């Protein structure tokens, strides 16, 4: 029958292709979901969708949106409200058995405009064979990197952050962890420097960025304009401390079994031969998972994101993907039916355990069979419960571009003057209404 197109980030395309294929067996031949890839970069993801939306591409049906695009797509009319489902089932489905943090990212002006499908929060990943106890706060991270450099050990702090959205995410986490905020609750005022407490938070965050950027043994890549991968730096043994989203867990086991991780030669364990399937994905039996995870524990550990204020946890910026029905769709009923099928319990287990993307269904985090394959589950749920959020505003794309340009390169941050420049650039973004 008809085709429901399903646009997703390219890096997640294989995972969502698998989910769509499962969802296509359950539709009685009434319709088919066809996954289509978008570039890497949240901003260029959005750009491609916005061109199709303003050009009235009537073949565009369902979109996997970064959590920061809700306000823009809702206010533009590009994402239909879930109440536009002709069956009237979308809103109840979106909230049922779903964590509240993700749901907050899917709303605008008191209505839902998307159904959460994946969420995200960053953890500390470390080498337990080199780092005796994982740092609990950022001054401790700095000290550990220095101690490693002095011992001749890998000294990079690999943070998934170059000159774009990941850098804005890191800054947002530090800022909110210190008690600040980019914008006011209603999104209409810049609150980086408007009170002494807010200015103090912004300065504290900038001081941490600058300190990490200039630790002895820091990555020479910080200053340049090119793109590096924290995940790959750690897998290659260039860093013993990494701050990243939890997809690095699935990556570490898979690439180790393939032979791509020098300090974790799972490719030399006979019991793991053939645990890569014929499309290249690590798909272990229960016993193979136990063998690979036990081996990995010697060289790979995880821990909460480091705090800014010692003594209590960080407030970690939430990430993820929400499923929205485009206003261009010719088939609203089937597009909303597809959204419900894409986020069902079976496909949520799959998106976390094979795709590396945290599920949004609360039940999974209370499910011992899921917990046995997703060992980070408790820290992830804790960090999603008291999460920082990036500002929700229709001009987010312009705000993030202006913020990232001030922050980058982080070696050139000077906390007091950079704080004022940030506030002035943020103000230009929201002055564009
Ligand atoms: O498509 C990928 C995605 O771009 C990127 O997304 C994550 O970082 C972004 C940049 F900070 C956040 O804006 C986003 O919210 C958050 O999920 O890494 C994911 C895997 F962790 C991928 O699935």
PDB file of C-alpha atoms in Angstrom, residues 60 64 74 89 151 204 210 265 310 329 389 421 424:
ATOM      1  CA  UNK A  60       7.375  13.767   3.695  1.00  0.00           C
ATOM      2  CA  UNK A  64      12.814  12.029  14.013  1.00  0.00           C
ATOM      3  CA  UNK A  74       5.515  23.596  16.582  1.00  0.00           C
ATOM      4  CA  UNK A  89      -4.871   7.876  19.955  1.00  0.00           C
ATOM      5  CA  UNK A 151      52.832   9.335  34.596  1.00  0.00           C
ATOM      6  CA  UNK A 204      32.146  29.254  36.737  1.00  0.00           C
ATOM      7  CA  UNK A 210      39.076  26.935  29.790  1.00  0.00           C
ATOM      8  CA  UNK A 265      41.212  -7.642  22.160  1.00  0.00           C
ATOM      9  CA  UNK A 310      31.425  19.031  44.822  1.00  0.00           C
ATOM     10  CA  UNK A 329       1.664  14.256   5.020  1.00  0.00           C
ATOM     11  CA  UNK A 389      17.434  21.321  29.485  1.00  0.00           C
ATOM     12  CA  UNK A 421      30.068  38.491  24.799  1.00  0.00           C
ATOM     13  CA  UNK A 424      25.279  40.019  23.894  1.00  0.00           C
TER      14      UNK A 424
END
